[PDB]
Amino acid sequence: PLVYTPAVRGGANPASGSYLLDPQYVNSGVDILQATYGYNINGTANADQLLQRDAILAILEYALKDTAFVNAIQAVAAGSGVTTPASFVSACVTKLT
Amino acid sequence: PLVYTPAVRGGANPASGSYLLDPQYVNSGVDILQATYGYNINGTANADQLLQRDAILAILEYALKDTAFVNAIQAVAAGSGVTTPASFVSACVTKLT
Amino acid sequence: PLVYTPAVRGGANPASGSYLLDPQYVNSGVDILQATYGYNINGTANADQLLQRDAILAILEYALKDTAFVNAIQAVAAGSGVTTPASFVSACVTKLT
Amino acid sequence: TATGVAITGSAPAASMDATLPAQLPISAASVQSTFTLNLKEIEESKEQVTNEELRNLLEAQMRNAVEEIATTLNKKLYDGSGAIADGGLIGLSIAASGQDYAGISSATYPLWNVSEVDAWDANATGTDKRQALKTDFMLELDRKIRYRPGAYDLILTTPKVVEQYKKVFEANRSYQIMTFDGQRVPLIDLGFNVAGYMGRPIIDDVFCSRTRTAAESAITTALGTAVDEGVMYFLKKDDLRFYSTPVVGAFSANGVYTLMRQLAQTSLYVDNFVVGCIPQLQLTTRKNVGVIKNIKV
Amino acid sequence: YAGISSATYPLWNVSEVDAWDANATGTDKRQALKTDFMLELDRKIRYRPGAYDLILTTPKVVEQYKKVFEANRSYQIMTFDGQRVPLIDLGFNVAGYMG
Amino acid sequence: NEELRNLLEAQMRNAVEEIATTLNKKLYDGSGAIADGGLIGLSIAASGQD
């Protein structure tokens, strides 16, 4: 089970529901990201959605900055059946399951 | 071999360098990103980083919006040993090999 | 592998692309020709059509003036089945191959 | 929301409105043209050529290149679903449909779609279906603009569909003769123009079309093409604006800002000109939009 | 007609409207004269913005243009007071198409 | 925006105008029925009902 907390230093769960992501340097070098993240805008979360939001922020704080995650998602995009990038995001599903 | 053009319509490679992402609705419901993406700010991309940036913008545009991928990344975070999410991304990277 | 140049004394490759053929006396006697030759008008000559243009100016500068080429082309115009002068020009393809 | 609770009730289930962001970048593409004319050519064409609009090559071709930017641009105002090859435009084919166009979808939000009188009508005989503009595809569109309470000012109409609009009249007219005693013989004309559908005039564009979607797969594989050539586009003129960037040194050529910039010289007797601009189109509020897709044409 | 074949430059070859249909029954498929022909030709002449002045009409086709009026015309007497009687013309001559 | 800036006052007239736009909607569909305001409406006020 994941014990994630929002990875900004102060301002994890804001009052306005607009969690401002920290700037992160993504290719380990040359590119910055600078996202935000708005909370509930179509109702609330349905207690599966508190776990999916728990992992969307986990794949976005720690994984894109990490240089071991991006070297494997590069080699998924170098497979011999991956074009037209909706089959990229369906090939890496079958890897994870 | 992943071929890829950016999913924003008239903003494929900008002149100012600041590729502004279109807002996508991520949790299949209730949230919103409104990300950006800065180009070369710590050097230039040396022809292997044109493939890592190729896979970062694919996992950011066409993956977090998809509701089959986010349930596939949810189950990895609900295993046995995925705590303090540097072990979450290490349990994610062994599944991608 | 001819290295053919246009036979005007000055004015081989003209600036405006209107290569004015100098007047030539064709039957060795009685007629005058007075052509021109416009260069690129439906694109560029794409490195193969330079060689075809190399053989049309040669048949126009140096061949119709000649008195032996015109007697050989006279003999093809008295063959067994040479009428309707598009079977004339297809009977001399089968001579030149 | 606003629910009905009892008079001795409790607090009813909090809620609040939602606003959404928008998009349409103008930062990526452009549209350009070049000349590459000599310095001898511009001189000896002042004596040899005859017409006065061919003697000056630099004056003529610069007009001939600005007016090519203008005619390649509204061709891509009905197209341009892509990229650098289209010119960075977006286009009225996707800005008047159920597609995304600003990041705001239509599957998630059903109120970001336009009014459609799609006339394929898949129940008739095969490979032909495409029922003609009768009259009730058009006062039925006006019903759908009223539920989503908007108005319109302008109709777009490829001149094939004006020819189908004009044949609506000839199924509903008949000539009549009156005031006949001893004067001049009656005098047939049998021809008529178009005032344009109740004071909202019908402009007609030669280059107007609409690329069929990928959801209309069985339509475009039964007709061979996807250009559809039969759209109407009931639009509002003050709700649809055009952008271009004023870079320094640029001049306005019929509203569109263009920049000249003669290039550098390498030798004598050569010029190498260029000319270009950078466009973008905007369609705020899909309320004031109505389309009559798939006419018999 | 001048030096230009229409196959290499398609901005020649005049906008035509044919009246054969190639699939009606019989041996004479000529599709007599509808008003749709003068609207279909005006459509294909609009895509290249030129405007005609004349129509040249062998006078058998003027009869076919005149027999279109006879399909849809009638006579209405919208004056009821007396003092005069109507007078039949039953004849009419052609001004031309759209002026 | 000068309308989303004041967050209390804007949501105040998005509620008063929401009470009104659900009120004529139940001027046609009332039938008592406490889950819609207790109105009656013209479904049974202009018919053969009681």
Distance from CA of D47 to the nearest CA of C (A): 13
Asked if D2's CB is within 8 angstroms of F35's CB, the reply is: no
Cβ neighbours of E99 in D, within 8 Å: 189, 191
* Dist CA F40 CA A51 (whole Å): 46
With a CB-CB cutoff of 8 Å, which residues 4-43 of chain D face chain C?
A: 38, 40-41
Distance separating alpha carbons of residues D73 and D88, to the nearest angstrom: 10
Q: Distances in Å between the alpha carbon of E1 and those of A91, C83, E12, E49?
A: 62, 25, 10, 22
| Integer Cα distance of A51 and A53 in angstroms | 5
Strands D251-253 and D256-258: antiparallel
d(CA F4, CA F27): 31
Name chain A contacts of D108, Cβ cutoff 8 Å: 42
Three-class DSSP category at D236:
coil
D43 by DSSP, 3-state: which?
helix
Q: How far apart are CA A51 and CA C13, in angstroms?
A: 76
CB atoms near residue D51 (< 10 Å) = 7
CA distance E33 to E54: 19
How many Cα atoms are found within 13 Å in the side-chain-facing hemisphere of A42?
Answer: 13
- Rounded CA separation E12/E4 (Å): 8
Nearest to B3 by CA among C31, E60, A83, C53: A83
Whole-Å CA distances, D22 to A73, B34, E54: 30, 10, 55
Residues of D in contact with B34 (CB under 8 A): 21
Residue B46 CB burial class (10 angstroms; 0-12, 13-18, ≥19)? exposed
The span from the CA of D100 to the CA of B22, in Å, is 11
Residue D73, both tokens:
């641009």
Residue C88 tokens, joined:
């004339």
The number of beta carbons lying within 10 Å of the beta carbon of residue E63 is 11
| DSSP track, B27-86 | SSSS-B---EEE--SSS---SSHHHHHHHHHHHHHSSSS-TTHHHHHHTTTTSSS--TTT
State how far the Cα of D113 lies from the Cα of D285, in Å rounded to an integer: 10
**Which chain B residues have a beta carbon less than 8 Å from that of D23?**
8-9, 22-23
**Which residues from E are below 8 Å from D194, CB to CB?**
none
Sign of the C-alpha dihedral, residues A58, A59, A64, A70? positive
Q: Are C16 and D269 in contact (CB < 8 Å)?
A: no
3-state secondary structure chain C: CCCCCCCCCCCCCCCCCECCCCCCECCCCCCECCCCCECCCCCCCCCCHHHHHHHHHHHHHCCCCCCCHHHHHHHHCCCCCCCCCCCHHHHCCCCCC
Chain D positions contacting chain F at CB under 8 Å are 1-6, 16-17, 19
The rounded distance, in Å, linking the Cα atoms of B35 and B64 is 12
Strands D187-188 and E93-94 turn out to be: parallel
DSSP chain E: --S--TTT-TT-S--------S-SSSS-------THHHHHHHHHTTTTT---------HHHHHHHHHHHTTSEEE-----S-S---------EE--TT-
Cα F13 to the chain's mean position, in Å? 14
C-alpha to C-alpha distance for C91 and C79, rounded to whole angstroms: 9
D287: phi then psi, degrees, rounded to nearest 5:
-55, -50
Place of tokens 């952008």: D243
CA angle at D187 for the pair D184 and D188, rounded to the nearest 5°: 165
Closest CA to B35 of D57, A24, E27: A24
- Whole-angstrom Cα Rg for chain C: 16
Nearest to D114 by CA among D297, D294, D283: D283
Please give the backbone phi and psi of residue D187, each rounded to the nearest 5 degrees, phi first. -145, 95
Chain C neighbours (≥3 Cβ pairs under 8 A) are: D
DSSP state of D38: B
φ/ψ (deg, to 5) at D244: -155, 155
Question: Among all chains, which residue has been given the structure tokens 């001795």?
Answer: D8
| Measured CA angle at D123 (ends D119, D126), to 5 deg | 95
CB atoms within 10 A of CB B48: 11
Distance CA A44, CA A14 (A): 15
Give CA angle at A87 (B93, B45), nearest 5°. Answer: 60
Cα A19 to the center of its chain, rounded Å: 14
| d(C-alpha D296, C-alpha D131), whole Å | 6
What CA–CA distance (Å, rounded) separates D150 from D287?
Answer: 6
Residue with the two structure tokens 């699939």: E23
Q: Which two tokens stand for residue F26?
A: 């139940």
Name the minimum distance, in Å, from the CA of D39 to any CA of chain C.
9
Q: Which residues contact D95 (CB under 8 A, 6 or more apart)?
A: D101, D281, D283, D286
**Between chain D and chain E, how many beta carbons pairs sit less than 8 Å apart?**
82
Q: Which two tokens stand for residue B29?
A: 């419901």
Q: Write the single-letter amino acid at E96.
A: G
What backbone phi and psi angles, to 5 degrees, belong to F7?
-85, -25
**What's the CA gap between A23 and D222, in Å, rounded?**
51
Ramachandran angles phi, psi of D63, nearest 5°: -70, -35
Q: How many CB atoms neighbour CB D20 within 10 A?
A: 13
D256 forms bridges with which residues in the sheet?
A: D253
SS3 A19: strand
CB-based touch D/F (3+ pairs, under 8 A): yes
Distance from CA of B63 to the nearest CA of D (A): 15
Residues 6+ positions from D171 with CB-CB distance below 8 Å = none
Are D160 and D132 in contact by the 8 Å Cβ rule? The answer is: no
DSSP symbols for F1-50: --SSSSHHHHHHHHHHHHHHHTTTGGGSS--S-GGG-S---TTTSSSS--
Residue D66 φ/ψ, nearest 5 degrees: -70, -45
Cα separation of E81 and E78, whole Å?
10
What is the tally of structural domains in chain D?
Answer: 1
CA A54, CA A35: separation in Å to the nearest integer?
17
Residues of chain F contacting D6 with CB distance shorter than 8 Å:
34
Residue B77 to residue B75: CA distance in whole angstroms:
5
- Cα–Cα–Cα angle for D196, D197, D199, rounded to 5 degrees: 80
Query: Which helix (H) or strand (E) covers residue B94, if one does?
Result: helix B87-95
3-state secondary structure D155-218: ECCCHHHHHHHHHHHCCCCCEEECCCCCCCCCEECCCCCCCCCCCCCECCCCCCCCCCCCCCHH
Helices and strands counted in chain D (H then E) = 5, 10
Please give the resolution of this entry in Å, rounded to 1 decimal.
3.5
Ordered alpha helix ranges (H), chain D: 41-44, 57-71, 141-147, 159-169, 217-223
Both structure tokens of D196: 């344009």
The structure tokens 């286009």 sit at: D91
d(Cα D89, Cα D74) in Å, to the nearest integer? Answer: 10
Maximum alpha-carbon separation in chain D: 100
Chain C closest-CA separation from residue D262 CA (Å): 21
The residue whose two tokens read 């692309």 is C17
Nearest alpha carbon to residue D281 among D254, D234, D243: D243
D283 interfacial to chain B (CB closer than 8 Å) = no
In Å, what is the CA distance from F33 to each residue of D4, F23, F40? 9, 14, 9
If residue A96 lies in a helix (H) or strand (E), which one and from where to where? helix A88-96
Concatenating the DSSP letter of every residue in A41-85 gives: SSS---SSHHHHHHHHHHHHHTTTT-TTHHHHHHHHTTSTT--TT
Residues in D closer than 8 angstroms to C38, CB to CB, are none
Residue type, D196: G
Alpha-carbon distance of B34 to B57, in angstroms, equals 14
Q: Spell out the domain ranges in chain A.
A: 1-97
Q: Mark yes or no for CB contact C15/D45 under 8 Å.
A: no
Helix A69-76 and helix B87-95: axis angle, to 10°? 20
CA B33, CA B95: separation in Å to the nearest integer?
Answer: 26
What phi, psi does E93 have (nearest 5°)? -130, 160
Query: How far does chain D reach from its first CA to its final CA, in angstroms?
Result: 46
Residue B78 contacts residue A97 (beta carbons within 8 Å): no
Contact A26, B35 (CB under 8 A): no
Q: D87: which residues sit within 8 A by CB, 6+ positions away?
A: D29, D30, D31, D72, D73, D76, D80, D279
**Range(s) of the domain holding residue D185:** 1-297
> How far apart, in whole angstroms, are the C-alpha atoms of residue A26 and residue D195?
61
Sequence length of chain F is 50
Question: Are the C-beta atoms of C64 and C24 separated by less than 8 Å?
Answer: yes
| Partners of D187 in the β-ladder | E93
Task: Tell me which chain B residue has its CA closest to the CA of residue D281.
Answer: B10
Q: What is the number of alpha carbons within 13 Å of residue D61 lying toward its C-beta?
A: 17
Find, among C6, E43, F15, the residue nearest to D166 by Cα.
Answer: E43
With residue D258 as reference, give the H or E element that holds it.
strand D256-258
Q: Do chains E and F touch (3 or more CB pairs under 8 A)?
A: no
Reading phi first (left if > 0) and then psi (alpha if -120 to 50, else beta), residue A19 is in beta
Query: What approach was used to elucidate this structure?
Result: cryo-EM
Half-sphere exposure of D85 (CA within 13 A, CB side): 4
CB D28 within 8 A of CB B13: yes
The first and second tokens of residue A71, run together, are: 């070297």
Residues of F contacting chain D (CB within 8 angstroms): 4, 11, 14-15, 18-19, 22, 26, 34-38
Residue B47 tokens read as: 């022809």
At C18, phi and psi to the nearest 5? Answer: -110, 85
* β-strand partners of E93: D187
The residue type found at D209 is S
Q: What is the dihedral of CA C70, C71, C73, C77, to 10 degrees?
A: 130
List of long-range contacts for B66-71, beta carbons under 8 Å, 24+ apart = B66/A89, B67/B28, B68/A90, B68/A93, B69/A89, B69/A90, B69/A92, B69/A93, B70/A52, B70/A55, B70/A56, B70/B26, B70/B27, B70/B28, B71/A52
Tokens coding D33: 């043209």
Strand, coil or helix: what is B92?
helix
Cβ contact D262:D61 at 8 Å: no
| β-bridge mates for residue D177, sequence order | E75
Which residue matches tokens 């990300």?
B35
In 3D, which of C5, C23, C15 has the Cα closest to residue C39?
C15
How distant, in Å, are the alpha carbons of B10, D57, D153 from that of D168?
40, 49, 22
Question: Residue A45 is which amino acid?
Answer: A
A70: phi then psi, degrees, rounded to nearest 5: -80, -25
Residue B38: what residue type? G
Interface residues on E facing D, Cβ-Cβ cutoff 8 A: 35-36, 38-40, 42-43, 46-47, 65-66, 68-69, 72-79, 84, 86-89, 91-99
